[PDB]
Design a binder for this molecule. Structure first.
Ligand code: MD1
Ligand code: PCI
Ligand code: SF4
Ligand code: SF4
Ligand code: 6MO
Lengths: 217, 1244, 509
């Protein structure tokens, strides 16, 4: 158990992290043609508007939350925000995700043209989001943010390369352990799935001149 | 590194532009190589398409990664004069999709054989070491024979090998020839011009062994019998570049943009030069989009409009204000001044045969063929036999020309046109009128069945002492059109508004076209022609030519052109375009295709009579000869079934036969020997006695039907075969969908020349072998399928009527899988045959019947009437009152050595065609050098024919169109007949010799040849009839001129001595079945038209995914919105079309451009793709020819009479089909009959 | 003032025979792959009709092109930059596969492999290329309305019938149809470029061809909505968008596009147009949409004007391009004779593929008619295709430029008929339309004779300029996979070097 603990929370996060990064770089340099969002909308427009927006607006709320939450307002106030704001986002996300999954599996045109990786990655995010929401009642048992303090302590030790990060997790509820592992696993699988589209969020567009012309080159 | 490049973000920004609306970037663009590398390819090869489109377009075949990937048109044709558009790029959408076939899911890769037939073949071979005897054991067992014939079209094909199928084929051919006769083996392949050598391959094998070569031009109804009637020419027309020289064009029943695609620009571009164009089609067709005026007569009634136009033309340009150009033109180039004899009737007269020199006392000083020379009056009232009539062609020389000269004194003369004003009296002549007859679907105009007209006549004192009244073709013609000439003819028009025998007011009723349009266009057209000296043209197609009365639609258009002097002038004339009939290097190709270099003659057969007979479509005939006779004919002298008229035509040597005699013709010689007489005499005596009979008399007795059939470059059972269900039942022996009862079951009248039996013989064909590159409908119903090379995998040559270039098909890569070129397939068959026949057939003697041939002296057969030797009306004289009876020796073991070498007859006898011959020794000498020679065996020392290229070089070296040396000898031979020099037409190119390798580098223009009547020149475009008019060469007709008057007994009695309006016929195919098998939805009778489709060339490309995707995904039928709405049909609904002949299933295309009353199922969508089961037959739905049936016309059976004499594809019955009506209804149950459980039901 | 050049195209609809050869060759070469089997870069539509995709001309429905806001500024109809990003998770206007057609194939192998003893004749049924499943029925295709295929009430929903009393055209005698072949317009103010969030679409400087970079495209699929001609097709398999590339691999060396060289009707002309890129926004944002046509003509520069010639040179236009521009058939048809007009100028994209309107047979009338100003040939007022329909298609509803084009074509015909039939000079029709005899004869040379060298005047794109053609000539095409193509920085993780480059530097300067 202690062995599995240091593995998953002291070693594994660096395996996943190194793979995430060098895999992203290598696929970017050697796989431009494979770097796309892989829209399936044209093949079946039904329910995509509701589902994709629920899913994306939800998962993006959580991403902002998770990011500034674990990597930067007393702690218990943040926990309160995480459960209510984060929880609501998680509900939107999960509904969107389940709808997208039902579609990917049962809409003939989408199912016939999917890759295995698309089913796998989506199925894992639906589990991860379900897991995420399931931790809410556990955090509720500790409204003083003591659980959140453990989780953030671990997150911060990991990203600053301070060893012993797993100690911070002493006594946190099991469910948080699962959520942390599946989440890291998602990073490990990231460069080998459609998730690479995330790197490409088109921020530059907001300030770009409309017409583009490329010179002889 | 692309990732690191992202940091040069800032560095790659160049200047902005348009006030900040734009930004120039200096960024990497290497990714662009991705599309560059797709375009790149290994090489391009020149090739073309061996399909029946008339396109004849040269393409660039791109090979990439060692595979054929796509094609784009070649654009390097020799350019036309500066004042004419060039031909490039040609092409069409069907052609652009051909590359799809090479590796597609429907490509035939290996020889295939029906499983049941393979299991029996192998079991038979285990018991009979000799394959002929193994075949005997299967075919002579009724149960065995039937087990494989009923499997036809029912699955079970298994992979075989070339060795296995070649042995079976050879064994079956030997068995058949040995036991029934060479003529029980046959081959069907069409249009050799699209791939000369490929056609020649099977034809050559068949011809060597004595099998029958089936015709195609007449069978497909592309042959316009009106052409041989008027000109004594199968078909000769101006090239498309010549349209550009016209200043007034009517596209009549010709959908130029769709069916003459690569040539359409000449039509769209000539408009910019000020040329006016008019479209005449019942629907709003693609051709209408390109014209200045759209006229829409009721389909099938065009002849009426043409008659009214002619009326106006004669009225205004010949009578009221005589056109100098027109008058002189009809005086010199038509039979108008010729004299017609009047026959006494009860109270009036009928037009009889034309007066011959032989009729007068001194025979007009005419000693040679006086009964074959026509007579006119000169402007000085004297009688004369002018130069050029058919009697001057044979037995003498130097007078067969159109010089206006006296055939006796050789002095210049001038022909008088009308007797009006110098007649001894006015006689009343009756003219037939059929405009009051017709079905309920067409408007009629009642007058009288016989219309009396006052004609100026002149009594003459004949040679036999009797006296007779005569008039000119001209006068008879003006009367027939209803032109009042001052004699106060009550049946002549007093104005264009007078409803009479044939006015603009009259035609408006019949056709629905406004009389003022008829008048205005007739006028514009004649005025344009008068001003330009003949530059008015009519482009005409199957929209008019596929009606039962195609001859009336054509003679009507043709008379318009004649009266305006347009035939024979560049920019003017009759421009008939249908299938690709013009194989330009004709006399170079004929010996190769029919083995005339080795044996003469071959066994040509006219296919319409052949299938009417053998697929037993006559057992269901509903049309009677009686109902087609002139009301002025003796009905009693024309009794019998339409098939009886064919049998009589055959025994009189008018039309060919197949099988020929009721006895194996390889056995006749043996019997003649024992009886002490030479074969010819023994045959004639046996025929007079009845010990030997023409096989046509007993087609079902078990020995008189074809048994082996070769099909290649054809989809006979899915495209061209009219009466599809009859072919399946009678030729194949399979389930069929015929809905009606035969003559017997309806207790009708049996024929008088042919045996009758109530249970007709079925499954006649013992072996059906089909060569193709895709599994077609015909392959699906065959016994053996042989994979053939596509057009991009073999060498061959192609020519067309549309342009003057000869160019090649080439192999871009060797044939894929186990495919082989047609040439190699037949060579291998000939080779196996040669060994398999040893011990069964040796050096044999064959008795072959040959009909009397047009363009041979024998054409001068029966000059004044029709005598049937079998009726004792005359003696049986082969070559005159019956067919020639020829002896042909065949060396069966030497078939392969012969097939693969150019025979000795080219040297011994020579070469020729179209009535002229020449020496061809120097060519044979050249050929020994180009093809090398046989080192030993039967053909030692002769040039070789091993490869398709050797065969092509033979075609090029022998023909006058491709070898200037031959062209000069050919024109010299012709000069002997005419007495005028024509060699000047080719002297300037005498050194020209077209080579196969040179045309692979650049298509080459051919050389002016006597085989044709237009010129290949740098200053004048090719225009049919140009040589007759300008070189004074006669048209090959009785009179030597364009023949407006058809005086053959049968033409007179069937009411066609002069053109007349004839309403569409009643096939009576609908009233006996409509409502008999209701599915609960409304049914309605509609006219079934089958114009040619936009998404295929016939059925070729019909299964092509590109064409299916641009079309509607499979078989569809077009209906007007009103008919569809009446029937509850929405666009794309499944529908069923059916009648007595059978049924077809398809989806509807609903459209406003289709007029109510007609439906169009564009010509051929065939039977292999997207067709559900039929609710009428409970079988797979049929095709468009499942609702048609062959009905011949007697006038197309006339032989032994100058221009009306036989020629392979020159004359014969035609496969007309437009008069057909069908019942249409929405389908209810859509069952696919495939066990897939995926069927539908259409509500309501 | 910044001069740029582009090879423009003019299609003479008067000569189009609606054969689709152009569409089949284009498909064989560029879009026969799975993912774009349903995509027809060049496609031909019969009008009246709604086209491919269905009703693509309906911008209220599809949101293509530009709008001119009240403040005078241009904005994509799809939305401004933030509105567009806000639609990225699911483009609400995106056309679905069914707006094109469900691509299908047939089970031909069943004809070959059907078992012995089948109860009925075997047949090949349709199967979807998207799902691989049996299709009970084919219900649509890319050219489903070909030749008035469908009920008039259905075809007449054609957006071009706007503001026209269309009932009379449902009468058999008033029937009309024409063909509209189309490809990408390679616009001066492309809406696709402006609507792509990743900046993957660009206009090439040297020749104006507009491309979607296959490395950089991220599959946001907003460009498809942005293009008002609906000429960008999503490749459903690769997840990236693709479009007509104006055959740049051929144009680059001076050859015509495949769909141009293969045009059977000889209706396509390719010629250089010089344009002032600095004037693009100003012309595209003119207030009245009926002025966009003339405002675009105003951005085209006179290639024989020494002022333009010196500026072109200064701005880098190759000499052979200037020279081709001087003999450009496109410039003669669009600028001098005024025969060619833009396709839907109101989308404000400044399209570079123009069209000469078609003539048509005369309309139905009480009698055979009278000789008009053109004698036995038609007068423009008698043509059966309603001129307002053509104007909705080409001139933002203004019939004046459409009538001038047709009238001029008819005048040429009248003048030539006088000459070739009557053997007389008659410039009356020409005078009426403002053409001189020399102009009419030149129009005739290009439109009627139309020699190959006159239909296509395509100069080289000069791939040697600003690049290194020598090492590329020596090593292009050996696709072993060096991993170094596509970036300017030489560093690469696989420690490799470009095969078509020289890495040993000269040390002798
Ligand atoms: N794309 C393509 N091209 C091909 C072929 C093909 O299969 N596909 N086949 C070849 C061959 S072998 C032939 S025989 C011709 O193409 C037939 O075309 P054509 O335009 O002469 O006949 P069609 O029978 O199609 O009729 C033409 C039009 O005439 C109208 N029409 C039909 N019936 C009539 C009538 O009774 N009277 C008048 N005045 N017009 C009528 C109709 O618009 C039709 O399309 C030729 N090239
Ligand atoms: O999802 C989260 C949200 Cl929303 C907040 Cl606010 C904080 Cl603080 C943390 Cl840690 C997570 Cl994970
Ligand atoms: S199919 Fe015929 S018309 Fe079409 S491209 Fe080929 S040869 Fe030309
Ligand atoms: S090939 Fe030319 S004529 Fe035929 S549809 Fe295409 S553009 Fe029109
Ligand atoms: Mo034909």
């Amino acid at each position: 158990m202690q062995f599995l603990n240091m593995f998953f929370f002291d070693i594994y996060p660096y395996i996943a992290g190194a793979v995430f990064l060098i895999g992203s770089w290598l696929r970017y340099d050697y796989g431009q043609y494979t770097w796309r969002a892989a829209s399936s909308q044209m093949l079946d427009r039904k329910g995509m508007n509701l589902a994709s927006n629920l899913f994306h607006i939800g998962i993006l709320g959580i991403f902002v939350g998770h990011f500034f939450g674990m990597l930067t307002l007393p702690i218990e106030v943040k926990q309160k925000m995480a459960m209510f704001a984060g929880g609501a986002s998680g509900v939107l996300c999960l509904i969107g995700g389940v709808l997208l999954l039902k579609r990917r599996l049962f809409s003939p045109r989408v199912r016939a043209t999917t890759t295995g990786a698309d089913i796998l990655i989506l199925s894992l995010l639906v589990i991860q989001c379900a897991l995420g929401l399931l931790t809410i009642p556990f955090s509720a048992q500790h409204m003083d943010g003591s659980e959140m303090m453990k989780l953030v302590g671990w997150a911060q030790s990991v990203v600053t390369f301070h060893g012993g990060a797993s100690q911070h997790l002493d006594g946190v509820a099991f469910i948080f352990r699962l959520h942390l592992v599946l989440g890291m696993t998602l990073f490990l699988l990231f460069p080998f799935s459609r998730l690479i589209h995330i790197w490409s969020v088109p921020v530059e567009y907001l300030t770009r001149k409309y017409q583009l012309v490329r010179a002889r080159h | 590194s692309k990732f690191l490049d992202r940091f040069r973000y800032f560095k790659q920004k160049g200047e902005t532009f348009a006030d900040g609306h734009g930004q120039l970037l200096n960024t990497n663009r290497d990714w662009e190589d991705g599309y560059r590398q797709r375009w790149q390819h290994d090489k391009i090869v020149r090739s073309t398409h061996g399909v029946n489109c008339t396109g004849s377009c040269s393409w660039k075949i791109y090979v990439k990664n060692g595979l054929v990937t796509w094609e784009t048109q070649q654009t390097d044709y020799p350019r036309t004069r500066p004042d004419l558009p060039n031909h490039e790029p040609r092409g069409c959408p069907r052609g652009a999709s051909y590359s799809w076939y090479l590796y597609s899911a429907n490509r035939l890769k290996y020889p295939m054989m029906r499983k049941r037939l393979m299991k029996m073949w192998r079991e038979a071979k285990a018991l009979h070491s000799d394959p002929v005897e193994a075949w005997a054991s299967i075919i002579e067992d009724a149960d065995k024979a039937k087990s494989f014939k009923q499997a036809r079209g029912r699955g079970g094909f298994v992979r075989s090998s070339w060795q296995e199928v070649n042995e079976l084929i050879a064994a079956s051919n030997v068995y058949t020839i040995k036991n029934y006769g060479p003529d029980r083996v046959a081959g069907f392949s069409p249009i050799p011009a699209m791939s000369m050598v490929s056609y020649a391959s099977g034809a050559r094998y068949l011809s060597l062994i004595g099998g029958t070569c089936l015709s195609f031009y007449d069978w497909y109804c592309d042959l316009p019998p009106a052409s041989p009637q008027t000109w004594g020419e199968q078909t000769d027309v101006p090239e498309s570049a010549d349209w550009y020289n016209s200043s007034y064009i009517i596209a009549w029943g010709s959908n130029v943009p769709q069916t003459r695609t690569p040539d359409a620009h000449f039509f769209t571009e000539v408009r910019y030069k000020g040329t006016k164009t008019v479209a005449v089609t019942p629907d709003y067709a693609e051709i209408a989009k390109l014209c200045d005026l759209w006229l829409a007569p009721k389909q099938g009634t065009d002849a009426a409009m043409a008659l009214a136009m002619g009326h106006v033309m004669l009225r205004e340009f010949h009578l009221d204000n005589p056109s100098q150009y027109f008058t002189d033109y009809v005086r010199r180039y038509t039979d108008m001044p010729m004299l017609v004899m009047l026959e006494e009737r009860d109270g009036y007269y009928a037009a009889g045969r034309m007066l011959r020199a032989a009729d007068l006392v001194d025979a007009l000083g005419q000693e040679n063929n006086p009964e074959w020379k026509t007579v006119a009056f000169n402007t000085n009232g004297e009688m004369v036999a002018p130069n050029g009539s058919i009697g001057f062609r044979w037995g003498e020389k130097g007078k067969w020309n159109l010089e206006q000269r006296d055939g006796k004194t050789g002095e210049e003369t001038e022909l008088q046109l009308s007797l009006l004003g110098s007649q001894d009296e006015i006689a009343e002549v009756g003219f037939p009128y059929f405009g009051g007859d017709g079905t309920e679907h067409f408007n009629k105009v009642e007058l009288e069945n016989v219309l009396l007209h006052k004609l100026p006549v002149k009594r003459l004192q004949l040679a036999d002492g009797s006296t007779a009244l005569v008039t000119t073709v001209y006068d008879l013609t003006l009367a027939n059109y209803g032109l009042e000439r001052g004699l106060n003819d009550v049946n002549c028009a007093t104005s264009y508004d007078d409803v009479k025998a044939y006015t603009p007011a009259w035609a408006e009723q019949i056709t629905g076209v406004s009389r003022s349009q008829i008048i205005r266009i007739a006028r514009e057209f004649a005025d344009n022609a008068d001003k330009t000296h003949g530059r008015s043209m009519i482009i005409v197609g199957a929209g008019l030519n596929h009606w039962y009365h195609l001859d009336m639609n054509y003679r009507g258009l043709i008379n318009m052109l004649i009266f305006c002097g347009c035939v024979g002038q560049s920019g003017g004339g009759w421009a008939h375009y249908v299938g690709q009939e013009k194989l330009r290097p004709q006399t170079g190709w004929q010996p190769l295709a029919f083995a005339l270099d080795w044996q003469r003659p071959a066994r040509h057969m006219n296919s319409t009579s052949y299938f009417y007979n053998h697929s037993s479509q006559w057992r269901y005939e509903t049309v009677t000869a009686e109902e087609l006779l002139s009301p002025m004919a003796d009905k009693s002298r024309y009794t019998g079934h339409l098939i009886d008229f064919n049998v009589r035509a055959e025994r009189m040597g008018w039309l060919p036969s197949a099988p020929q005699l009721g006895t194996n013709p390889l056995t006749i010689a043996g019997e003649a020997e024992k009886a002490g007489m030479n074969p010819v005499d023994y045959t004639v005596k046996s025929l007079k006695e009845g010990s030997i009979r023409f096989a046509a008399e007993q087609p079902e007795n078990g020995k008189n039907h074809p048994r082996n059939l070769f099909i290649w470059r054809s989809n006979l059972l899915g495209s061209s075969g009219k009466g599809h269900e009859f072919m399946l039942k009678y030729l194949l022996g399979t389930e069929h969908g015929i809905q009606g009862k035969d003559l017997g079951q309806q207790g009708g009248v049996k024929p008088e020349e042919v045996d009758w039996q109530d249970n007709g013989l079925e499954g006649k064909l013992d072996l059906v072998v089909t060569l193709d590159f895709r599994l077609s409908s015909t392959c699906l119903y065959s016994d053996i399928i042989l994979p053939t090379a596509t057009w991009y995998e073999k060498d061959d040559m192609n020519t067309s009527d549309m342009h003057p270039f000869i160019h090649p098909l080439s192999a871009a890569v060797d044939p894929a899988w186990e495919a082989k070129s047609d040439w190699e397939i037949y060579k291998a068959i000939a080779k196996k045959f040669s060994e398999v026949c040893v011990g069964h057939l040796g050096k044999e003697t064959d008795i072959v019947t040959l009909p009397i041939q047009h363009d041979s002296a024998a054409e001068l057969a029966q000059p004044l009437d029709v005598k049937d030797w079998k009726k004792g009306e005359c003696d049986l004289i082969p070559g005159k009152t019956a067919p020639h009876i020829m002896v042909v020796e065949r060396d069966y073991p030497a078939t392969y050595e012969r097939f693969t070498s150019i025979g000795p007859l080219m040297e011994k006898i020579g070469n020729g065609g179209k009535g002229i011959a020449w020496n061809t020794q120097s060519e044979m000498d050249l050929l020994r050098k180009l093809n090398y020679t046989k080192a030993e065996g039967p053909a030692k020392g002769q040039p070789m024919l091993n490869t398709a290229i050797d065969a092509a070089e033979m075609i090029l070296t022998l023909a006058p169109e491709t070898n200037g040396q031959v062209a000069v000898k050919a024109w010299a031979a012709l000069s002997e007949f005419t007495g005028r020099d024509h060699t000047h037409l080719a002297l300037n190119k005498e050194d020209e010799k077209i080579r196969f390798r040179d045309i692979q580098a650049q298509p080459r223009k051919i050389i002016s040849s006597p085989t044709w009547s237009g010129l290949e020149d740098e200053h004048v475009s090719y225009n049919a009839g140009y040589t007759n008019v300008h070189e004074l060469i006669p048209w090959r007709t009785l009179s030597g001129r364009q023949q407006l008057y058809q005086d053959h007994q049968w033409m007179r009695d069937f009411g066609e001595s002069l053109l007349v309006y004839r309403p569409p016929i009643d096939t009576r195919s609908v009233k006996e079945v409509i409502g008999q098998k209701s599915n609960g939805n409304q049914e309605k009778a509609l006219n079934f038209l089958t114009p040619h489709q936009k998404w295929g060339i016939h059925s070729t490309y019909s299964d092509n995914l590109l064409m299916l995707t641009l079309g509607r995904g499979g078989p569809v039928v077009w209906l007007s919105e009103a008919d569809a709405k009446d029937l509850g049909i929405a666009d794309n609904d499944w529908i069923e079309v059916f009648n007595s002949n059978g049924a077809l299933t398809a989806r509807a295309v609903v459209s406003q451009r289709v007029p109510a009353g007609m439906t169009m199922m564009y010509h051929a969508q065939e039977r292999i793709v997207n067709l559900p089961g039929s609710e009428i037959t409970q079988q797979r739905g049929g095709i468009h020819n499942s609702v048609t049936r062959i009905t011949p016309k007697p006038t197309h059976m006339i032989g032994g009479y100058a221009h009306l004499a036989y020629g392979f594809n020159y004359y014969g019955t035609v496969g007309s089909n437009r008069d057909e009506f069908v019942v249409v209804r929405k389908m209810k149950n859509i069952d696919w009959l495939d066990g897939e459980g995926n069927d539908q039901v259409q509500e309501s | 003032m910044k001069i740029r050049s582009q090879v423009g195209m003019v299609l003479n609809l008067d000569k189009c025979i609606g054969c689709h050869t152009c569409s089949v060759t284009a498909k064989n070469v560029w879009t026969s792959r799975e993912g774009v089997e349903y995509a027809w870069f060049n496609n031909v539509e019969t009008k009246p009709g709604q086209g491919f995709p269905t009703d693509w001309e309906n911008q209220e429905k599809y949101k293509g092109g530009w709008i001119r806001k009240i403040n005078g500024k241009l904005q994509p109809r799809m939305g401004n930059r933030a509105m567009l990003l806000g639609k990225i998770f699911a483009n609400p206007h995106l056309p679905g596969i069914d707006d094109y057609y469900e691509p299908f194939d047939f089970d031909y192998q069943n004809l070959h492999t059907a078992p012995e003893g089948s109860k009925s004749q075997p047949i090949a049924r349709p199967r979807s290329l998207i799902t691989g499943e049996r299709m009970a029925k084919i219900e649509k295709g890319p050219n489903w309305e070909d030749d008035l295929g469908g009920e008039f009430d259905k075809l007449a929903k054609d957006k071009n019938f706007d503001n026209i009393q269309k009932a009379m055209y449902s009468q058999f005698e008033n029937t009309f149809m024409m063909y509209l072949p189309r490809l990408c317009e390679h616009c001066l103010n492309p809406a696709c470029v402006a609507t792509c969030p990743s900046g993957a679409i660009y206009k090439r400087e040297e020749d104006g061809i507009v491309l979607i970079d296959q490395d950089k495209c991220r599959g946001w699929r907003m460009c498809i909505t942005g293009c008002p001609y609906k000429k960008i097709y999503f490749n459903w398999k690769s997840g990236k968008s693709e479009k007509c590339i104006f055959c740049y691999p051929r144009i680059e060396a001076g050859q015509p596009t495949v769909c141009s060289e293969t045009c059977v009707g000889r209706i396509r002309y390719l010629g250089v147009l010089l344009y002032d890129a600095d004037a693009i926004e100003r012309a595209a944002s003119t207030e009245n949409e009926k002025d966009l046509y003339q405002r675009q003509l105003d951005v085209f520069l006179d290639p024989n004007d020494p002022k333009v010639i010196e500026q072109a040179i200064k701005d880098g236009i190759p000499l052979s391009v200037i020279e081709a521009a001087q003999q450009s058939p496109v410039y003669k048809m669009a600028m001098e004779w005024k025969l060619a007009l833009p396709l839907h100028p109101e989308y404000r994209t400044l399209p570079m593929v123009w069209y000469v309107p078609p003539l048509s047979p005369i309309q139905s009338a009480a009698d055979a008619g009278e000789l008009g100003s053109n004698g036995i040939l038609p007068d423009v007022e008698s043509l059966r295709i309603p001129v307002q329909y053509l104007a909705n298609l080409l001139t933002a509803g203004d019939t004046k430029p459409v009538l001038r084009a047709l009238k001029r074509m008819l005048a040429m015909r009248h003048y030539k008929r006088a000459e070739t039939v009557d053997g007389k000079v008659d410039t009356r029709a020409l005078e009426e339309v403002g053409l001189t005899e020399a102009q009419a004869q030149e129009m005739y040379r290009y439109l009627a004779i139309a020699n190959y060298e006159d239909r296509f005047v395509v100069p080289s794109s000069h791939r040697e300029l600003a690049r290194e053609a020598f090492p590329e000539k020596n090593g292009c095409g050996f696709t072993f996979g060096d991993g170094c193509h596509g970036s300017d920085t030489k560093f690469n993780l696989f420690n490799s070097r470009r095969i078509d480059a020289i890495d040993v530097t000269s040390k002798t300067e």
